[PDB]
Design a binder for this molecule. Sequence first.
Ligand SMILES: O=P(O)(O)OC[C@H]1O[C@H](OP(=O)(O)OP(=O)(O)O)[C@H](O)[C@@H]1O
Ligand SMILES: O=P(O)(O)OC[C@H]1O[C@H](OP(=O)(O)OP(=O)(O)O)[C@H](O)[C@@H]1O
Ligand SMILES: Oc1ncnc2cn[nH]c12
Ligand SMILES: Oc1ncnc2cn[nH]c12
Ligand SMILES: [Mg+2]
Ligand SMILES: [Mg+2]
Ligand SMILES: [Mg+2]
Ligand SMILES: [Mn+2]
Lengths: 186, 196
Amino acid sequence: YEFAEKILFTEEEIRTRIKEVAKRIADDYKGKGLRPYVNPLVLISVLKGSFMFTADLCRALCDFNVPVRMEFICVSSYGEGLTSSGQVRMLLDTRHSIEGHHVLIVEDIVDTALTLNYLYHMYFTRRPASLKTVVLLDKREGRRVPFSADYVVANIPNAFVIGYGLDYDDTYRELRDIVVLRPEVY
Amino acid sequence: REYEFAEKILFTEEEIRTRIKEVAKRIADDYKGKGLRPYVNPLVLISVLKGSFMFTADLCRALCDFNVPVRMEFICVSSYGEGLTSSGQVRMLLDTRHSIEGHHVLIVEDIVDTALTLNYLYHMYFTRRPASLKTVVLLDKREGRRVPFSADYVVANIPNAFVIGYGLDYDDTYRELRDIVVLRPEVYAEREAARQ
Ligand SMILES: O=P(O)(O)OC[C@H]1O[C@H](OP(=O)(O)OP(=O)(O)O)[C@H](O)[C@@H]1O
Ligand SMILES: O=P(O)(O)OC[C@H]1O[C@H](OP(=O)(O)OP(=O)(O)O)[C@H](O)[C@@H]1O
Ligand SMILES: Oc1ncnc2cn[nH]c12
Ligand SMILES: Oc1ncnc2cn[nH]c12
Ligand SMILES: [Mg+2]
Ligand SMILES: [Mg+2]
Ligand SMILES: [Mg+2]
Ligand SMILES: [Mn+2]
């Protein structure tokens, strides 16, 4: 890993933490009457970065017998400096309606939270039975708009991280670990 | 693991992991002569959502094990919907963000059956002049073809029974299972009935 200046989490550490958060999530819904087809926990995976976290998370949730429904959404910026409210163009949205469902937005990282805050409100206005967010990494001090994730795997400082779905110029998403990009590389 | 809705388990998580590793090794050896490099020459992985999400996540990591640098592109194509059989029509819900022209592209799919999805995808992408176009499918039902199609890499050939798990679904259900199992017809027939 010559392009990295430090290792934050190895695949093994990530694996364990996800399992813990998944158990928490499962316990938190243990009374919501989740059932396949009619009442699944809807995971709204925000592309592209969360693809890896989502694959591992849904499997950990399955370990706790939580029936899930996978949704993948793709968003795009409208242009440079066009919004501040984190408004984004929806290229791909959920296949089913979330209205009346228990929904969980899945993200790899939250920093400024502009986009995630926007998406949260958006889905909130669609009337799901419930709406929460689970984010792998949280740069708590990076906020440009107040926003709290319901579940977080790890809190991190303002470093540029890569790996485990996270990229730098669409590179390194495939690493099994999360590392800090060497500022000499960036 | 025991699944009430399963007739039987086709492949366990360990089995899939072992097979994906072997296929990734082959892909690495096969692309060695292309000099793939991060930023300038990555192997473009075209992940066919929703089904391919899990295979894609595990495969890109296995490719990373063998130093194959990749660039992920997520597209979304629909054909079966909530049912058990091909609609006969393939819908492109989301296409690539970037052009594949002049790049080495590998389509990553969870299963090839009638081959209408891949046939549609191939014919679409081939016209865009990529440097090369190959396909890796986790599962192949080689005797379900309605149109001919031969993937470059196949992790496993399977019989003609409805399979779920590891990204594969029946009415957007069971994609999260760690193993690939055969769905009991009494389960999907009841659900098809309820839906009908
Ligand atoms: O809270 P914020 O400051 O918005 O930072 C986090 C977001 O930015 C990144 O997405 P990106 O735009 O890089 O898209 P990507 O997931 O496809 O890489 C990351 O994957 C999160 O979605
Ligand atoms: O060879 P074929 O008969 O075309 O069948 C294979 C395709 O059908 C399924 O997709 P589906 O249309 O169910 O979409 P999905 O990935 O979202 O589940 C499967 O994931 C393949 O993409
Ligand atoms: O550190 C980080 N690494 C990758 N993507 C993002 C987005 N925000 N912050 C990031
Ligand atoms: O067995 C099967 N399971 C899930 N999707 C498909 C498509 N074709 N055949 C399938
Ligand atoms: Mg993102
Ligand atoms: Mg990014
Ligand atoms: Mg399907
Ligand atoms: Mn598919």
